[PDB]
Amino acid sequence: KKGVVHGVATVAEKTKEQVTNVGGAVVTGVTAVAQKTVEGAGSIAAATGFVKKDQ
Amino acid sequence: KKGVVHGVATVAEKTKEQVTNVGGAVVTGVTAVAQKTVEGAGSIAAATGFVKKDQ
Amino acid sequence: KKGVVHGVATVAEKTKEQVTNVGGAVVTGVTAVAQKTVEGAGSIAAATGFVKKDQ
Amino acid sequence: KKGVVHGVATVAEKTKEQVTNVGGAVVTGVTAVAQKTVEGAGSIAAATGFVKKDQ
Amino acid sequence: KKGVVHGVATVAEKTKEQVTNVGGAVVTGVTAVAQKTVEGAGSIAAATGFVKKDQ
Amino acid sequence: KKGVVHGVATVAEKTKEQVTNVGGAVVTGVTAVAQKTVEGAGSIAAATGFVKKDQ
Amino acid sequence: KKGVVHGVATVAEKTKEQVTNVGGAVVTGVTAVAQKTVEGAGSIAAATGFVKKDQ
Amino acid sequence: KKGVVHGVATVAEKTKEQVTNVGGAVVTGVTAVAQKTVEGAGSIAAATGFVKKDQ
Amino acid sequence: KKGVVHGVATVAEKTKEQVTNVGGAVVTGVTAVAQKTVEGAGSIAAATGFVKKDQ
Amino acid sequence: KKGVVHGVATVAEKTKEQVTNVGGAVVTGVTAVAQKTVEGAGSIAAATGFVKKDQ
Numbered sequence: 001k002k003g004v005v006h007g008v009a010t011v012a013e014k015t016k017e018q019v020t021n022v023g024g025a026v027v028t029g030v031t032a033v034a035q036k037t038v039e040g041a042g043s044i045a046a047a048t049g050f051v052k053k054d055q
Numbered sequence: 056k057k058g059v060v061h062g063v064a065t066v067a068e069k070t071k072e073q074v075t076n077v078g079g080a081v082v083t084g085v086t087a088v089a090q091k092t093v094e095g096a097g098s099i100a101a102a103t104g105f106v107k108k109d110q
Numbered sequence: 111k112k113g114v115v116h117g118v119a120t121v122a123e124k125t126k127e128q129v130t131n132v133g134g135a136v137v138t139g140v141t142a143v144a145q146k147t148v149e150g151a152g153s154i155a156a157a158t159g160f161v162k163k164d165q
Numbered sequence: 166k167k168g169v170v171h172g173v174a175t176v177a178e179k180t181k182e183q184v185t186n187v188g189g190a191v192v193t194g195v196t197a198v199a200q201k202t203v204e205g206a207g208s209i210a211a212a213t214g215f216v217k218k219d220q
Numbered sequence: 221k222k223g224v225v226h227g228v229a230t231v232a233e234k235t236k237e238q239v240t241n242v243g244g245a246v247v248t249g250v251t252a253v254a255q256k257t258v259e260g261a262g263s264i265a266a267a268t269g270f271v272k273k274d275q
Numbered sequence: 276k277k278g279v280v281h282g283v284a285t286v287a288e289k290t291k292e293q294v295t296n297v298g299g300a301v302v303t304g305v306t307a308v309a310q311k312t313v314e315g316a317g318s319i320a321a322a323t324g325f326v327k328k329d330q
Numbered sequence: 331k332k333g334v335v336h337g338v339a340t341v342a343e344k345t346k347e348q349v350t351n352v353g354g355a356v357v358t359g360v361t362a363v364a365q366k367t368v369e370g371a372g373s374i375a376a377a378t379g380f381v382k383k384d385q
Numbered sequence: 386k387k388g389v390v391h392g393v394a395t396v397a398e399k400t401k402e403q404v405t406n407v408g409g410a411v412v413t414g415v416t417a418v419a420q421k422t423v424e425g426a427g428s429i430a431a432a433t434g435f436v437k438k439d440q
Numbered sequence: 441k442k443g444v445v446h447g448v449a450t451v452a453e454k455t456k457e458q459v460t461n462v463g464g465a466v467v468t469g470v471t472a473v474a475q476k477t478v479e480g481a482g483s484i485a486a487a488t489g490f491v492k493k494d495q
Numbered sequence: 496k497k498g499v500v501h502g503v504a505t506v507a508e509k510t511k512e513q514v515t516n517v518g519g520a521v522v523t524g525v526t527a528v529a530q531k532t533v534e535g536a537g538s539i540a541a542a543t544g545f546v547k548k549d550q
């Protein structure tokens with residue numbers, strides 16, 4: 001076989017899960033957050049996949 | 056087989072799940088948030104997939 | 111087989127779920143949010159798939 | 166088989182769900198939000214798939 | 221076989237999970253956060269995959 | 276002060292919430308159930324406060 | 331002060347929450363269930379407060 | 386002070402939370418269940434407070 | 441002071457939390473369950489407070 | 496002071512937490528279970544407080 005990509009690719013066979021991202025956010029997984037009190041200014045309480053590039 | 060992509064591709068066979076994103080947000084997964092009190096200015100309480108690029 | 115894409119594609123066979131996004135938001139998954147009080151100015155309380163690019 | 170796309174495509178066979186988006190928003194999944202009080206100016210309380218690009 | 225990529229690629233066969241990211245965040249895994257009180261200004265309470273590049 | 280009860284009482288001062296039950300069911304709290312498929316004969320899918328005394 | 335009870339009482343002062351139960355079920359708390367598939371005969375999927383006394 | 390109870394009592398002062406139960410179930414706490422697939426006959430998947438006295 | 445109980449009592453002062461139970465189940469605490477697949481016949485997957493007295 | 500109990504009592508002063516149980520189950524503490532696959536017939540996967548007296 002032959003393949004040429006510029007990116008971003010994701011090429012496969014017999015594949016149970018696939019995610020391609022440029023951005024941006026993708027949530028595909030099981031996630032449970034239980035929480036009782038959030039205070040403070042300002043605290044990232046429960047972050048799973050996170051990116052902060054403030055300018 | 057032969058394939059040429061510019062991106063972003065996601066090419067496969069026999070594949071249970073697929074996500075392609077440029078952006079942007081995609082939520083495809085099970086997610087449960089239970090929460091009782093959020094305060095503060097300003098706190099990211101429960102973030103799963105998150106991207107902040109303020110300018 | 112042969113395939114040429116510019117992107118964004120999502121090409122497959124025998125595939126249970128598919129999402130293609132450029133944007134933008136796509137919500138296809140099970141999601142439960144239970145919440146009792148949100149305060150503060152301004153706090154992202156419960157974000158699952160999120161993108162903030164304010165200019 | 167043969168396929169050439171400009172994007173955004175989503176090509177498949179035997180496929181239970183499909184979403185193609187350029188935009189924009191698509192909601193196809195089960196979603197339950199229960200909520201008791203939202204205050205503050207201005208707090209994104211419960212966001213599932215979200216994109217904010219204010220200029 | 222032959223392959224030439226510019227990156228970022230992810231090329232495979234017989235592959236159970238795949239993630240390609242440029243960004244950005246991708247959450248595909250099981251995650252449980254249980255939490256009782258978050259205070260302080262400002263403390264990253266529970267971060268799993270995290271990136272902070274404030275300027 | 277003086278108090279004599281037979282039960283069931285609930286006596287208080289300065290009290291934000293109160294529930295008295297003999298029975299029976301009382302639901303006063305925030306509750307979110309999101310659900311996609313229930314099968315089987317017969318499975319209690321999502322029970323929060325539950326009592327089964329079949330004879 | 332003086333108090334005589336037969337039960338079940340709940341006597342207090344300056345008290346934020348109170349529950350008295352004989353039964354029976356009382357749900358006063360925040361609860362989020364997100365769920366995607368329930369099968370089997372018969373499986374208690376997600377039980378929070380539960381009592382089964384079948385005869 | 387003086388107190389005589391038969392039970393079940395719960396007597397206090399300056400008390401943030403109170404639960405009295407004879408039964409029966411009481412759910413007053415924050416709870417998040419996220420779940421993707423339940424099978425089998427019959428499996429208690431996610432039980433928090435649970436009592437099974439089948440006869 | 442003087443106190444005579446038959447049980448079950450719970451007598452206190454200046455007390456943040458109280459639970460009295462005869463039964464039965466009481467859930468007052470923060471709880472997060474995230475789960476992806478449950479199979480088998482029949483397996484207690486995730487049990488927090490649990491009592492099984494089948495006859 | 497003077498006290499006579501039959502049991503089960505729990506008598507105190509200046510006390511942050513209290514639990515009295517006859518039964519039965521009480522869950523008052525923070526608990527996080529994250530889990531990916533449960534199989535087998537039948538295996539107690541993750542048990543925190545547990546009692547099995549099958550007859």
Ligand SMILES: CNc1ccc(-c2nc3ccc(O)cc3s2)cc1
Nearest residue numbers: 022023061062063077078116117118
């Ligand atoms: C995040 N902001 C952003 C803006 C623009 C893009 C673009 N991606 C492509 C790809 C192929 C093409 O012919 C044109 C474009 S423009 C991506 C991201």
Ligand SMILES: CNc1ccc(-c2nc3ccc(O)cc3s2)cc1
Nearest residue numbers: 042044052097098099107262264272
């Ligand atoms: C010292 N370590 C540190 C980590 C994180 C922070 C953050 N500050 C903000 C403010 C607004 C917002 O939406 C998100 C965040 S995160 C600050 C400090």
Ligand SMILES: CNc1ccc(-c2nc3ccc(O)cc3s2)cc1
Nearest residue numbers: 002003004057058059113222223224
């Ligand atoms: C070893 N390096 C490598 C890079 C890329 C490939 C590719 N194979 C295909 C097939 C179909 C298609 O539309 C695109 C592509 S790209 C293969 C191998």
Ligand SMILES: CNc1ccc(-c2nc3ccc(O)cc3s2)cc1
Nearest residue numbers: 006007225226227228242243271273
């Ligand atoms: C952390 N900041 C950062 C900025 C830029 C990069 C880049 N990586 C590549 C790779 C290939 C290419 O043709 C161009 C670039 S630019 C990486 C990181």
Ligand SMILES: CNc1ccc(-c2nc3ccc(O)cc3s2)cc1
Nearest residue numbers: 006007008062226227228242243244
């Ligand atoms: C984090 N900031 C960032 C900005 C830009 C990039 C880019 N990655 C590629 C890859 C191929 C290409 O032809 C162009 C570009 S630009 C990556 C990261």
Ligand SMILES: CNc1ccc(-c2nc3ccc(O)cc3s2)cc1
Nearest residue numbers: 006007008022023061062063242243
């Ligand atoms: C994070 N900010 C960002 C801006 C731009 C990009 C771009 N990626 C590509 C890829 C191919 C192409 O022909 C054009 C572009 S532009 C990526 C990231």
Ligand SMILES: CNc1ccc(-c2nc3ccc(O)cc3s2)cc1
Nearest residue numbers: 278332333334387388389442443451
């Ligand atoms: C030391 N053991 C003890 C047991 C029980 C008590 C009680 N005090 C009160 C007051 C008012 C009321 O309606 C009921 C009761 S019960 C006090 C002490």
Ligand SMILES: CNc1ccc(-c2nc3ccc(O)cc3s2)cc1
Nearest residue numbers: 281282283336337338352353407408
């Ligand atoms: C679980 N089944 C059940 C049946 C009956 C009861 C009763 N509790 C009281 C209390 C005082 C009284 O004068 C009478 C009765 S009867 C409780 C439970």
Ligand SMILES: CNc1ccc(-c2nc3ccc(O)cc3s2)cc1
Nearest residue numbers: 372373374427429437482484492537
């Ligand atoms: C060996 N360990 C074991 C634990 C638990 C069980 C249970 N069997 C049932 C049947 C019906 C129902 O509503 C709940 C349950 S739980 C069986 C065995």
Ligand SMILES: CNc1ccc(-c2nc3ccc(O)cc3s2)cc1
Nearest residue numbers: 446447448493501502503517518519
């Ligand atoms: C486990 N099975 C079980 C059955 C019965 C009990 C009882 N505990 C008390 C206490 C005082 C009283 O006057 C009566 C009774 S009965 C306890 C356990």
Ligand SMILES: CNc1ccc(-c2nc3ccc(O)cc3s2)cc1
Nearest residue numbers: 336337338391392393407408462463
């Ligand atoms: C679990 N099954 C059950 C049946 C009956 C009870 C009873 N509790 C009391 C208390 C005072 C009283 O005068 C009568 C009764 S009966 C409790 C439990």
Ligand SMILES: CNc1ccc(-c2nc3ccc(O)cc3s2)cc1
Nearest residue numbers: 391392393446447448462463517518
């Ligand atoms: C688990 N099964 C069960 C049955 C009965 C009980 C009883 N507890 C009391 C307490 C005081 C009283 O005057 C009567 C009774 S009966 C408890 C448990």
